[PDB]
PDB file of C-alpha atoms and ligand atoms in Angstrom:
ATOM      1  CA  UNK A   2     -64.090  -4.189  53.311  1.00 22.51           C
ATOM      2  CA  UNK A   3     -66.257  -3.684  50.201  1.00 21.50           C
ATOM      3  CA  UNK A   4     -67.540  -7.152  49.257  1.00 21.27           C
ATOM      4  CA  UNK A   5     -67.253  -6.310  45.557  1.00 20.46           C
ATOM      5  CA  UNK A   6     -63.536  -5.616  45.876  1.00 24.88           C
ATOM      6  CA  UNK A   7     -61.827  -7.425  42.998  1.00 26.63           C
ATOM      7  CA  UNK A   8     -59.069  -9.881  43.913  1.00 27.94           C
ATOM      8  CA  UNK A   9     -56.370 -11.393  41.790  1.00 28.35           C
ATOM      9  CA  UNK A  10     -54.946 -14.629  43.022  1.00 27.59           C
ATOM     10  CA  UNK A  11     -51.565 -15.652  41.810  1.00 26.61           C
ATOM     11  CA  UNK A  12     -49.733 -18.891  42.223  1.00 29.68           C
ATOM     12  CA  UNK A  13     -48.357 -21.391  39.708  1.00 30.08           C
ATOM     13  CA  UNK A  14     -50.286 -24.225  41.372  1.00 30.37           C
ATOM     14  CA  UNK A  15     -54.044 -24.579  41.046  1.00 30.60           C
ATOM     15  CA  UNK A  16     -54.441 -26.279  44.438  1.00 27.88           C
ATOM     16  CA  UNK A  17     -53.383 -23.132  46.281  1.00 27.23           C
ATOM     17  CA  UNK A  18     -55.252 -20.793  43.941  1.00 29.05           C
ATOM     18  CA  UNK A  19     -58.284 -22.941  44.658  1.00 32.20           C
ATOM     19  CA  UNK A  20     -57.878 -22.756  48.441  1.00 34.32           C
ATOM     20  CA  UNK A  21     -57.472 -18.984  48.386  1.00 33.28           C
ATOM     21  CA  UNK A  22     -60.445 -18.485  46.107  1.00 31.45           C
ATOM     22  CA  UNK A  23     -62.721 -20.633  48.226  1.00 33.30           C
ATOM     23  CA  UNK A  24     -61.521 -18.921  51.389  1.00 32.43           C
ATOM     24  CA  UNK A  25     -62.335 -15.528  49.868  1.00 30.31           C
ATOM     25  CA  UNK A  26     -65.814 -16.792  49.016  1.00 29.44           C
ATOM     26  CA  UNK A  27     -66.366 -17.672  52.689  1.00 28.30           C
ATOM     27  CA  UNK A  28     -65.356 -14.154  53.694  1.00 30.14           C
ATOM     28  CA  UNK A  29     -67.841 -12.772  51.207  1.00 28.44           C
ATOM     29  CA  UNK A  30     -65.631 -11.977  48.193  1.00 29.88           C
ATOM     30  CA  UNK A  31     -66.782 -13.392  44.837  1.00 27.33           C
ATOM     31  CA  UNK A  32     -65.086 -10.955  42.483  1.00 24.64           C
ATOM     32  CA  UNK A  33     -61.964 -13.115  42.247  1.00 23.79           C
ATOM     33  CA  UNK A  34     -59.643 -13.959  39.358  1.00 22.70           C
ATOM     34  CA  UNK A  35     -56.603 -16.201  39.003  1.00 21.06           C
ATOM     35  CA  UNK A  36     -53.217 -15.836  37.346  1.00 20.89           C
ATOM     36  CA  UNK A  37     -50.403 -18.364  37.011  1.00 23.37           C
ATOM     37  CA  UNK A  38     -47.343 -16.138  37.249  1.00 23.22           C
ATOM     38  CA  UNK A  39     -46.073 -12.592  37.205  1.00 19.81           C
ATOM     39  CA  UNK A  40     -46.558 -12.015  33.486  1.00 19.54           C
ATOM     40  CA  UNK A  41     -50.072 -13.506  33.379  1.00 20.13           C
ATOM     41  CA  UNK A  42     -50.877 -11.442  36.487  1.00 20.76           C
ATOM     42  CA  UNK A  43     -49.561  -8.148  35.061  1.00 22.67           C
ATOM     43  CA  UNK A  44     -51.632  -8.608  31.921  1.00 24.89           C
ATOM     44  CA  UNK A  45     -54.828  -9.026  33.930  1.00 23.42           C
ATOM     45  CA  UNK A  46     -53.958  -6.088  36.211  1.00 19.03           C
ATOM     46  CA  UNK A  47     -53.507  -4.116  33.013  1.00 18.54           C
ATOM     47  CA  UNK A  48     -57.127  -5.070  32.228  1.00 20.74           C
ATOM     48  CA  UNK A  49     -57.929  -2.853  35.224  1.00 20.01           C
ATOM     49  CA  UNK A  50     -60.469  -3.171  38.008  1.00 20.31           C
ATOM     50  CA  UNK A  51     -58.326  -4.992  40.580  1.00 17.98           C
ATOM     51  CA  UNK A  52     -58.211  -3.797  44.159  1.00 17.64           C
ATOM     52  CA  UNK A  53     -56.146  -6.436  45.930  1.00 18.74           C
ATOM     53  CA  UNK A  54     -53.500  -9.030  45.049  1.00 18.59           C
ATOM     54  CA  UNK A  55     -52.554 -12.224  46.779  1.00 19.84           C
ATOM     55  CA  UNK A  56     -49.481 -13.808  45.452  1.00 20.63           C
ATOM     56  CA  UNK A  57     -47.082 -16.678  45.651  1.00 18.13           C
ATOM     57  CA  UNK A  58     -43.344 -16.198  45.267  1.00 18.44           C
ATOM     58  CA  UNK A  59     -41.813 -19.069  43.346  1.00 18.17           C
ATOM     59  CA  UNK A  60     -43.294 -19.096  39.853  1.00 16.96           C
ATOM     60  CA  UNK A  61     -41.834 -19.327  36.315  1.00 14.99           C
ATOM     61  CA  UNK A  62     -41.855 -16.367  33.865  1.00 13.04           C
ATOM     62  CA  UNK A  63     -41.921 -13.811  36.685  1.00 12.12           C
ATOM     63  CA  UNK A  64     -41.771 -14.691  40.347  1.00 11.37           C
ATOM     64  CA  UNK A  65     -43.679 -12.992  43.152  1.00 13.49           C
ATOM     65  CA  UNK A  66     -40.935 -10.665  44.384  1.00 10.07           C
ATOM     66  CA  UNK A  67     -40.531  -9.259  40.837  1.00 10.25           C
ATOM     67  CA  UNK A  68     -44.282  -8.923  40.472  1.00 12.22           C
ATOM     68  CA  UNK A  69     -44.416  -7.001  43.739  1.00 12.73           C
ATOM     69  CA  UNK A  70     -41.552  -4.711  42.664  1.00 13.98           C
ATOM     70  CA  UNK A  71     -43.192  -4.137  39.312  1.00 17.18           C
ATOM     71  CA  UNK A  72     -46.567  -3.309  40.896  1.00 17.05           C
ATOM     72  CA  UNK A  73     -45.058  -0.786  43.358  1.00 19.04           C
ATOM     73  CA  UNK A  74     -42.924   0.829  40.657  1.00 19.64           C
ATOM     74  CA  UNK A  75     -45.858   1.471  38.321  1.00 19.07           C
ATOM     75  CA  UNK A  76     -47.445   4.856  39.020  1.00 19.66           C
ATOM     76  CA  UNK A  77     -50.821   3.409  38.037  1.00 16.02           C
ATOM     77  CA  UNK A  78     -50.816   0.545  40.610  1.00 16.68           C
ATOM     78  CA  UNK A  79     -48.084   1.534  43.104  1.00 17.09           C
ATOM     79  CA  UNK A  80     -50.379   1.292  46.183  1.00 15.44           C
ATOM     80  CA  UNK A  81     -52.300  -1.728  45.041  1.00 15.73           C
ATOM     81  CA  UNK A  82     -52.351  -3.928  48.152  1.00 16.42           C
ATOM     82  CA  UNK A  83     -50.206  -7.020  47.634  1.00 17.55           C
ATOM     83  CA  UNK A  84     -50.322  -9.906  50.080  1.00 22.73           C
ATOM     84  CA  UNK A  85     -47.591 -12.548  49.783  1.00 22.81           C
ATOM     85  CA  UNK A  86     -48.698 -16.170  50.333  1.00 23.93           C
ATOM     86  CA  UNK A  87     -45.657 -18.390  50.002  1.00 20.79           C
ATOM     87  CA  UNK A  88     -43.737 -21.369  51.388  1.00 18.52           C
ATOM     88  CA  UNK A  89     -40.539 -19.227  51.623  1.00 17.78           C
ATOM     89  CA  UNK A  90     -40.098 -18.661  55.333  1.00 15.89           C
ATOM     90  CA  UNK A  91     -36.484 -17.559  55.761  1.00 16.94           C
ATOM     91  CA  UNK A  92     -36.199 -14.140  57.428  1.00 18.06           C
ATOM     92  CA  UNK A  93     -34.107 -13.017  54.447  1.00 17.81           C
ATOM     93  CA  UNK A  94     -36.989 -13.478  52.040  1.00 15.73           C
ATOM     94  CA  UNK A  95     -39.455 -11.783  54.339  1.00 14.96           C
ATOM     95  CA  UNK A  96     -37.114  -8.803  54.612  1.00 11.38           C
ATOM     96  CA  UNK A  97     -36.721  -8.553  50.841  1.00 11.12           C
ATOM     97  CA  UNK A  98     -40.448  -8.802  50.224  1.00  9.38           C
ATOM     98  CA  UNK A  99     -41.253  -6.416  53.062  1.00 11.72           C
ATOM     99  CA  UNK A 100     -38.615  -3.949  51.915  1.00 12.69           C
ATOM    100  CA  UNK A 101     -40.010  -4.368  48.424  1.00 15.49           C
ATOM    101  CA  UNK A 102     -43.299  -3.009  49.668  1.00 17.16           C
ATOM    102  CA  UNK A 103     -45.325  -6.121  50.588  1.00 15.94           C
ATOM    103  CA  UNK A 104     -48.592  -5.248  52.301  1.00 11.60           C
ATOM    104  CA  UNK A 105     -48.365  -8.512  54.232  1.00  9.78           C
ATOM    105  CA  UNK A 106     -46.707 -11.937  54.222  1.00  9.95           C
ATOM    106  CA  UNK A 107     -48.158 -15.375  54.972  1.00  8.16           C
ATOM    107  CA  UNK A 108     -46.170 -18.611  55.082  1.00  7.31           C
ATOM    108  CA  UNK A 109     -47.484 -21.893  53.673  1.00  7.35           C
ATOM    109  CA  UNK A 110     -49.061 -23.988  54.996  1.00  7.11           C
ATOM    110  CA  UNK A 111     -51.674 -21.704  56.549  1.00  8.66           C
ATOM    111  CA  UNK A 112     -55.077 -22.022  58.190  1.00  9.13           C
ATOM    112  CA  UNK A 113     -58.342 -20.379  57.162  1.00  9.52           C
ATOM    113  CA  UNK A 114     -58.042 -18.326  60.321  1.00  8.23           C
ATOM    114  CA  UNK A 115     -54.550 -17.019  59.563  1.00  6.14           C
ATOM    115  CA  UNK A 116     -55.515 -15.730  56.098  1.00  7.07           C
ATOM    116  CA  UNK A 117     -58.616 -13.841  57.210  1.00  6.17           C
ATOM    117  CA  UNK A 118     -56.597 -12.377  60.065  1.00  2.50           C
ATOM    118  CA  UNK A 119     -53.904 -11.059  57.709  1.00  2.00           C
ATOM    119  CA  UNK A 120     -56.389  -9.733  55.172  1.00  2.00           C
ATOM    120  CA  UNK A 121     -58.210  -7.804  57.873  1.00  2.00           C
ATOM    121  CA  UNK A 122     -54.873  -6.530  59.118  1.00  2.00           C
ATOM    122  CA  UNK A 123     -54.211  -5.089  55.676  1.00  2.00           C
ATOM    123  CA  UNK A 124     -57.748  -3.717  55.362  1.00  2.00           C
ATOM    124  CA  UNK A 125     -57.339  -2.065  58.763  1.00  2.00           C
ATOM    125  CA  UNK A 126     -54.186  -0.192  57.822  1.00  2.00           C
ATOM    126  CA  UNK A 127     -55.549   0.972  54.477  1.00  2.00           C
ATOM    127  CA  UNK A 128     -58.894   1.977  55.941  1.00  2.00           C
ATOM    128  CA  UNK A 129     -60.774  -0.418  53.678  1.00  2.00           C
TER     129      UNK A 129
HETATM  130 MN1   MN B 201     -45.174 -21.660  43.517  1.00  2.00          MN
HETATM  131 XE1   XE B 202     -51.406 -17.217  46.425  1.00  2.00          XE
END
């Protein structure tokens, strides 16, 4: 995928945001920003330019499911790819997120390999 693609990384914990960001760097993506929750994320997406979103689920202000639903419901971002990266692993949460339009779902903890694999899976289906 285009190495200038702009990513938005969302999680309420810096450690994870940091892992994701560094991982993206390895893959060749430097246009990367961070957000700490749904609200903070929506504001930046409103700033335009974003082409991909990686997000956590449990976060104050607006959690990841809500963010996802909001992004898919907005005519201006509805197809924005959204990859869930969360510790929630119950099948019931995966269903909800998936039904809600998630482009992918990764469970924490995860390896460098797993992430890249999922990202490419999403690129592959969107022809990116
Ligand atoms: Mn969290
Ligand atoms: Xe994330």
